[PDB]
Amino acid sequence: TKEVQWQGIFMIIVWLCVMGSLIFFANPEASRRVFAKFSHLQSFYGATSVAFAFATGLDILAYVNAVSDEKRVLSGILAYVDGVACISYLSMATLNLYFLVDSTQGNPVWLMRYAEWIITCPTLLYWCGLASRADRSSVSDIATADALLLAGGALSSILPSWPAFFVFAGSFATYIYVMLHMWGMFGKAMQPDFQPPPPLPRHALHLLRCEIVMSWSIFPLVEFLRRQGYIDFQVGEAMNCVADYAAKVGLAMIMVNCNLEQ
Amino acid sequence: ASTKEVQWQGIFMIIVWLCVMGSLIFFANPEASRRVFAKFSHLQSFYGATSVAFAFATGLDILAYVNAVSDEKRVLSGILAYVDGVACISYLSMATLNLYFLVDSTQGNPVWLMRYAEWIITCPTLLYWCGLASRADRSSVSDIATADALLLAGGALSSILPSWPAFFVFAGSFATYIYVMLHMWGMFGKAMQPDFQPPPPLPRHALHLLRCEIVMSWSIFPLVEFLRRQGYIDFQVGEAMNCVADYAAKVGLAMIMVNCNLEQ
Numbered sequence: 001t002k003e004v005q006w007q008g009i010f011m012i013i014v015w016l017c018v019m020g021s022l023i024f025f026a027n028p029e030a031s032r033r034v035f036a037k038f039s040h041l042q043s044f045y046g047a048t049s050v051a052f053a054f055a056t057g058l059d060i061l062a063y064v065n066a067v068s069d070e071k072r073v074l075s076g077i078l079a080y081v082d083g084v085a086c087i088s089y090l091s092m093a094t095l096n097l098y099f100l101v102d103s104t105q106g107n108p109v110w111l112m113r114y115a116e117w118i119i120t121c122p123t124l125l126y127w128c129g130l131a132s133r134a135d136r137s138s139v140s141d142i143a144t145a146d147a148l149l150l151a152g153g154a155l156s157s158i159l160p161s162w163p164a165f166f167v168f169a170g171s172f173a174t175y176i177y178v179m180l181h182m183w184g185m186f187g188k189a190m191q192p193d194f195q196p197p198p199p200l201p202r203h204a205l206h207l208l209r210c211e212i213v214m215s216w217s218i219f220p221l222v223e224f225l226r227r228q229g230y231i232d233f234q235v236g237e238a239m240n241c242v243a244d245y246a247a248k249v250g251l252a253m254i255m256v257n258c259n260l261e262q
Numbered sequence: 263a264s265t266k267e268v269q270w271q272g273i274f275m276i277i278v279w280l281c282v283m284g285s286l287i288f289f290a291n292p293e294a295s296r297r298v299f300a301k302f303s304h305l306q307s308f309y310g311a312t313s314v315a316f317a318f319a320t321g322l323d324i325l326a327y328v329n330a331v332s333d334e335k336r337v338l339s340g341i342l343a344y345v346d347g348v349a350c351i352s353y354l355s356m357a358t359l360n361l362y363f364l365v366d367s368t369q370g371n372p373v374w375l376m377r378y379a380e381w382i383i384t385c386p387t388l389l390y391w392c393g394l395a396s397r398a399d400r401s402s403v404s405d406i407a408t409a410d411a412l413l414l415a416g417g418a419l420s421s422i423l424p425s426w427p428a429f430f431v432f433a434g435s436f437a438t439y440i441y442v443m444l445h446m447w448g449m450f451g452k453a454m455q456p457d458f459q460p461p462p463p464l465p466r467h468a469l470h471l472l473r474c475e476i477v478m479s480w481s482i483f484p485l486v487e488f489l490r491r492q493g494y495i496d497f498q499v500g501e502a503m504n505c506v507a508d509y510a511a512k513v514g515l516a517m518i519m520v521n522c523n524l525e526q
């Protein structure tokens with residue numbers, strides 16, 4: 001608990017800069033045609049945005065109400081992640097943002113979603129570290145792999161077939177490395193001997209590592225199925241919105257319960 | 263116990279819902295709903311999205327029930343679980359099934375009897391919940407729950423009458439909604455007093471945030487209906503505001519009581 005606030009502030013500045021450049025480099029005629037070919041996309045982003053707004057509301061009430069200083073700090077990090085997600089989705093619904101066209105279908109690659117993911121996923125992993133009192137170097141290395149992972153995802157969408165294949169597969173492979181080590185550090189902390197004691201009970205550490213595996217796995221699955229031609233773009237965008245929301249509010253639902261218990 | 267009673271209320275809610283959903287399926291015109299969803303392409307997304315939101319809202323209420331700081335906390339978090347669940351499946355239904363609907367006199371826009379059905383099962387139940395929070399007289403709670411139910415039916419009926427009977431039934435509805443909000447505001451007030459016995463299960467500040475939440479959120483429905491019937495917003499813009507309002511009205515109550523549990 002040494003100003004999560006500072007982490008949240010750095011998050012916001014990186015976001016605004018990226019949002020800045022996405023506005024300045026946008027092609028508005030291009031975005032008009034994307035939203036005209038795909039008429040459900042504004043609704044999806046709009047709806048997701050409102051959802052995270054209310055999600056951020058709930059996290060604020062968890063912060064202002066320190067049942068513990070341990071559980072003040074953890075509710076603070078979720079407030080920023082959910083807020084970042086809120087405004088990124090508002091942006092996607094309302095503004096003309098620069099985007100890539102993918103090699104496989106010529107579908108749009110939303111750099112704002114990838115930007116959100118790169119600011120928030122490594123922060124969610126750092127949050128996993130506080131919950132489990134993990135080694136700071138072990139947390140750092142997964143936060144890094146996660147960031148490289150996501151960039152891999154984005155890059156892979158604009159390469160030809162074989163370099164596309166390799167970068168996606170390497171990405172996917174790092175995602176396994178990440179989920180395994182995340183699973184590990186929650187496990188180290190579930191042990192009866194473990195010092196220092198974790199700020200959450202044994203059961204809640206387990207529900208958290210299960211939540212991350214179930215929710216986060218949907219993104220690689222959507223990307224695989226859409227790139228191959230098995231779902232269309234809009235069906236994938238829907239699953240992504242539900243997944244994004246699920247991944248984040250899932251963590252705030254499980255810690256609301258910890259407060260109620262203690 | 264009172265937990266058994268909340269369960270029983272929830273069960274009656276589910277049976278009334280299924281019957282109404284039943285008849286809406288049996289009497290649907292599928293060619294009609296295909297044309298409605300073809301003229302208005304955002305409607306499935308709105309209902310779908312709202313549905314997922316209430317599902318997660320119902321998730322949060324379950325964790326509040328299993329984890330009740332006190333038994334009154336269990337009773338109050340239990341009632342919100344059923345209301346949010348009812349809302350969840352009503353919206354899933356609207357997105358996925360062909361449901362019988364009315365065409366309104368003013369625009370020939372669809373009147374979703376499933377939304378009205380949800381409202382009639384849940385709004386009177388939310389008012390009864392306001393009673394437990396404020397330890398109000400049972401007859402005062404009953405009379406607002408009744409007026410609220412008649413109110414909503416008034417809303418629905420008014421959409422399929424000609425101009426002057428339409429006008430009177432809507433205005434009488436609107437008028438009862440004022441009567442309801444005033445008396446709701448009252449019973450929370452009686453309970454905020456320092457002398458009040460028996461002590462309310464929520465602190466003074468939270469009783470105030472609740473009566474403010476209901477007034478802000480619930481007032482959006484009559485406003486959407488007024489503005490759409492007159493031609494100032496189109497149908498889809500109104501449906502969006504309704505979805506956001508419905509969700510807001512309900513999860514607003516669960517956000518404020520999550521805080522009461524945290525406070526000790």
Ligand SMILES: CCCCCCCC/C=C\CCCCCCCC(=O)OC[C@H](O)CO
Pocket residue numbers: 024025026027028
């Ligand atoms: C360079 C210093 C200038 C000082 C001001 C700060 C802003 C700088 C940042 C981005 C400028 C974007 C310029 C790139 C070219 C225009 C992008 C654009 O208009 O998109 C049009 C579309 O692609 C076809 O019509």
Ligand SMILES: CCCCCCCC/C=C\CCCCCCCC(=O)OC[C@H](O)CO
Pocket residue numbers: 035039040041042043046047048050051054304307308309311312315501502503505506509
């Ligand atoms: C928190 C509950 C879940 C979230 C809310 C569920 C209801 C969705 C309604 C509005 C979303 C925000 C407004 C977005 C409305 C659609 C945007 C729009 O209408 O765009 C024009 C269209 O793309 C041209 O064909």
Ligand SMILES: CCCCCCCC/C=C\CCCCCCCC(=O)OC[C@H](O)CO
Pocket residue numbers: 008053054056057060063076079080082083084086087
């Ligand atoms: C639409 C409005 C509805 C409300 C939802 C907001 C929308 C999200 C906005 C920004 C993201 C960053 C928000 C970060 C919140 C951090 C909360 C916190 O920890 O604040 C501490 C204290 O109250 C003060 O110093």
Ligand SMILES: CCCCCCCC/C=C\CCCCCCCC(=O)OC[C@H](O)CO
Pocket residue numbers: 104156161163164165166168169172179213217220221224227
């Ligand atoms: C905890 C459980 C974790 C398990 C994982 C959950 C499910 C992952 C779903 C899909 C991964 C697909 C990866 C397969 C390798 C990629 C094939 C491919 O990339 O297709 C070529 C295309 O050109 C683009 O480059």
Ligand SMILES: CCCCCCCC/C=C\CCCCCCCC(=O)OC[C@H](O)CO
Pocket residue numbers: 176179180183184186187188190191192213
């Ligand atoms: C095929 C690839 C799919 C990827 C699947 C990723 C999900 C990880 C699941 C299990 C890892 C099991 C081995 C990790 C061992 C550490 C955890 C442990 O021992 O559990 C804690 C114990 O209960 C406290 O006392």
Ligand SMILES: CCCCCCCC/C=C\CCCCCCCC(=O)OC[C@H](O)CO
Pocket residue numbers: 265266268269272317318320321324327340343344346347348350351
């Ligand atoms: C998570 C997805 C939800 C999807 C939507 C489906 C409809 C849900 C309706 C009710 C939910 C459960 C209500 C919680 C039960 C509390 C009452 C209780 O269990 O106590 C009574 C006691 O057991 C006496 O026998």
Ligand SMILES: CCCCCCCC/C=C\CCCCCCCC(=O)OC[C@H](O)CO
Pocket residue numbers: 433434436437438440441444
């Ligand atoms: C469009 C035209 C419609 C007209 C406008 C809306 C009408 C307001 C409705 C109810 C107010 C309820 C009043 C407060 C509750 C009853 C007061 C009461 O009976 O108590 C005795 C008191 O001392 C004596 O004022």
Ligand SMILES: CCCCCCCC/C=C\CCCCCCCC(=O)OC[C@H](O)CO
Pocket residue numbers: 440443444447448451452454455477481
């Ligand atoms: C579309 C427009 C919708 C119209 C919505 C109107 C809502 C009325 C709410 C409050 C009025 C307050 C005055 C009437 C009753 C006062 C009770 C009270 O405030 O009591 C608190 C205090 O503790 C005493 O000691």
Ligand SMILES: *C/C=C(C)/C=C/C=C(C)/C=C/C1=C(C)CCCC1(C)C
Pocket residue numbers: 117120121124149150152153154168171172173175216217219220223244247248
């Ligand atoms: C808050 C948002 C979260 C947790 C988002 C998670 C995203 C992923 C784990 C994405 C994984 C991907 C791969 C492993 C390879 C293909 C591309 C990605 C980025 C979808």
Ligand SMILES: *C/C=C(C)/C=C/C=C(C)/C=C/C1=C(C)CCCC1(C)C
Pocket residue numbers: 381384385413414416417418432435436439480481483484487508511512
């Ligand atoms: C859980 C959902 C809620 C709180 C729904 C509430 C609905 C209303 C308060 C509707 C009010 C109306 C009027 C006062 C006049 C016109 C008809 C209505 C039904 C739109």
